[PDB]
Design a protein around this ligand. Structure first.
Ligand SMILES: CC(=O)N[C@@H]1[C@@H](O)[C@H](O[C@@H]2O[C@H](CO[C@H]3O[C@H](CO[C@H]4O[C@H](CO)[C@@H](O)[C@H](O)[C@@H]4O[C@H]4O[C@H](CO)[C@@H](O)[C@H](O)[C@@H]4O)[C@@H](O)[C@H](O[C@H]4O[C@H](CO)[C@@H](O)[C@H](O)[C@@H]4O[C@H]4O[C@H](CO)[C@@H](O)[C@H](O)[C@@H]4O)[C@@H]3O)[C@@H](O)[C@H](O[C@H]3O[C@H](CO)[C@@H](O)[C@H](O)[C@@H]3O[C@H]3O[C@H](CO)[C@@H](O)[C@H](O)[C@@H]3O[C@H]3O[C@H](CO)[C@@H](O)[C@H](O)[C@@H]3O)[C@@H]2O)[C@@H](CO)O[C@H]1O
Ligand SMILES: [Ca+2]
Length: 432
């Protein structure tokens, strides 16, 4: 008995979000084996359309099936066995189609099929992997290429309109900041429900209410918009939910990201007070509880980003219920002056190599030398916090030189900015 399971071969993820930026996307599907195979070991893979209803019910999702005629396995779906690496793989190609909708996630559930009798499949999870496909061909302006570093920017939305993301372009016209965070909605106690709830201050709520004009223009150009969550001075907190409390709060976060058509969350474990341990939604504060919340949030929105600030007790436990952090931490950004580090089977491609405090000044600059150092170190992200038009002189000074190294194109000097809650692009600096 040789136990098998399935995953995407390029990412090593059992659940993999695919962004189509061109007409084709190629990967491999990999079966991992627990023992050395023999000469007769064999298996195939197939799209398992029937499994999608089971998957959607389990995750409370509603993904449509990606058109099967657009998906091809090489070699009739037969997996080529590598006895020395205890694995077997086959190439899978995803073609972009006509009649697919923008801004919709489709699913390719893949199953092991026709396995030889020496292979044992423990359950339906091990039998399957899943691709969650989004057509990004037209929402291409933040996409700077394969393998480049990407930007992650927090807006203090109490003060600054996130449309200022659009102030930041390279000379080649690409948008610098791949991911932006609305900092921040809060976790707070709801006495009427006896559980935590998402609590949005009036500035956060105004953005959500007006997401068509103040948030969706970013997404139309390919920027991912995340809702920031932050502790907020009561017994609830992002690193102190029980298993049940985390499951419930994760569903509320996913419901915000669905209702307002956002791209995921940032969790920042700060400002909470000590929990009431008699409340069943709460538990002793711990990095294990934080990891539980991240895992449950990814299960509730597998198509969306689950990201963390590495501060407090938010990051560090590398498995939940046997599932490695690679499956439920998409990006981790560190405190100003530090570089993030991976846990579990994450790589530094999921990590920030610099965090720049744009309002107060700390964390260094995205210079040519720093860009090269971060590439050499294998980092995926650079993070910035609290840029504002009033400080664009400083902000853009700290971005000089790095873009030529990361992208072959420097960041251009700003010519537009946005005022709070106002969709109008104003002239920078004339209209300040
Ligand atoms: C990632 C990442 O970086 N993560 C963090 C990040 O969080 C840090 O960001 C900074 O955070 C700090 C701390 O914020 C948290 O606390 C404050 C204060 O909360 C307490 O007081 C409130 C009233 O003021 C109470 O309502 C609240 O309940 C708290 O009181 C309880 O607890 C204390 C004990 O701690 C007890 O004493 C009390 O009794 C009570 O029990 C809080 O306001 C913050 O929450 C708001 O903001 C977050 C988003 O950041 C939202 O998610 C929240 O909903 C909330 O906003 C809403 O409520 C507030 C009122 O609370 C409304 O005003 C608002 O409109 C919303 O409705 C957090 O819980 C902040 O202090 C920092 O703020 C400054 O910088 C930002 C920009 O980064 C500015 O937008 C902001 O205005 C602040 O700016 C001032 O200070 C700057 C220097 O720090 C300066 O550059 C600015 O020009 C400005 O200067 C002026 O004020 C100075 C004094 O503050 C003064 O010196 C100066 O002369 C000027 O007058 C910032 O957000 C970052 C930091 O790098 O790092 C990580 O740690
Ligand atoms: Ca910590």
């Amino acid at each position: 008995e040789n136990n098998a399971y399935l995953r995407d071969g390029k990412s090593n993820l059992v659940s993999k979000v695919v962004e189509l930026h061109g007409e084709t996307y190629a990967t491999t599907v990999k079966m991992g084996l627990s023992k050395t195979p023999n000469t007769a070991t064999s298996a195939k893979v197939k799209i398992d359309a029937a499994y999608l209803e089971t998957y959607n019910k389990a995750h409370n999702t509603d993904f449509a099936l990606y058109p099967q005629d657009l998906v091809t396995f090489a070699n009739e779906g037969i997996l080529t066995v590598n006895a020395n690496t205890k694995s077997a793989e086959v190439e899978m190609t995803i073609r972009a189609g006509e009649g697919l909708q923008e801004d919709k996630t489709y699913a390719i559930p893949v199953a092991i099929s026709d396995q030889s009798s020496d292979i044992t499949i423990k359950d339906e999870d091990a039998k399957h992997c899943i691709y969650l496909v989004k057509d990004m061909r037209n929402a291409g302006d933040a996409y700077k290429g394969e393998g480049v570093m990407q930007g992650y920017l927090f807006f203090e939305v109490n003060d600054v309109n996130p449309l200022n993301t659009l102030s930041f372009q390279l000379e080649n016209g690409k948008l610098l900041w791949d991911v932006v965070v609305l900092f921040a909605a809060n976790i707070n106690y709801d006495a009427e429900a006896g559980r935590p709830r998402v609590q949005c201050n009036p500035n956060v709520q105004y953005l959500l209410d007006n997401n068509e004009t103040l948030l969706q223009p970013l997404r139309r150009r390919g920027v991912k918009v995340l809702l920031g969550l932050l502790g907020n001075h009561d017994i609830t907190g992002l690193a102190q939910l029980s298993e049940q409390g985390a499951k419930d709060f994760a569903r509320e976060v996913a419901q915000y990201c669905k209702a307002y058509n956002l791209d995921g969350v940032n969790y920042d474990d700060e400002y909470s007070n000590s929990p009431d341990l008699s409340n069943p939604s709460l538990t002793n504060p711990s990095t294990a509880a934080a990891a539980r919340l991240c895992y449950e949030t990814k299960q509730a929105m597998p198509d969306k980003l689950v990201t963390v600030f590495d501060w407090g007790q938010m990051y560090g436990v590398a498995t939940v219920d046997g599932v490695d952090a690679k499956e439920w931490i998409d990006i981790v950004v560190a405190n100003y002056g530090s570089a993030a580090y991976p846990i579990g089977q994450m790589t530094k491609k999921q990590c920030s190599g610099i965090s720049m405090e744009f309002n107060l000044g700390g964390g260094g600059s995205l210079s040519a030398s720093k860009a090269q150092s971060m590439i050499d170190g294998g980092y995926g992200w650079f993070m910035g916090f609290a840029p504002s038009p009033a400080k664009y002189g400083s902000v853009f000074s700290r971005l000089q030189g790095g873009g030529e190294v990361l992208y072959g194109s420097n960041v251009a000097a700003p010519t537009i900015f946005y005022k709070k809650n106002d969709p109008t692009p104003y002239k920078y600096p004339d209209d300040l």
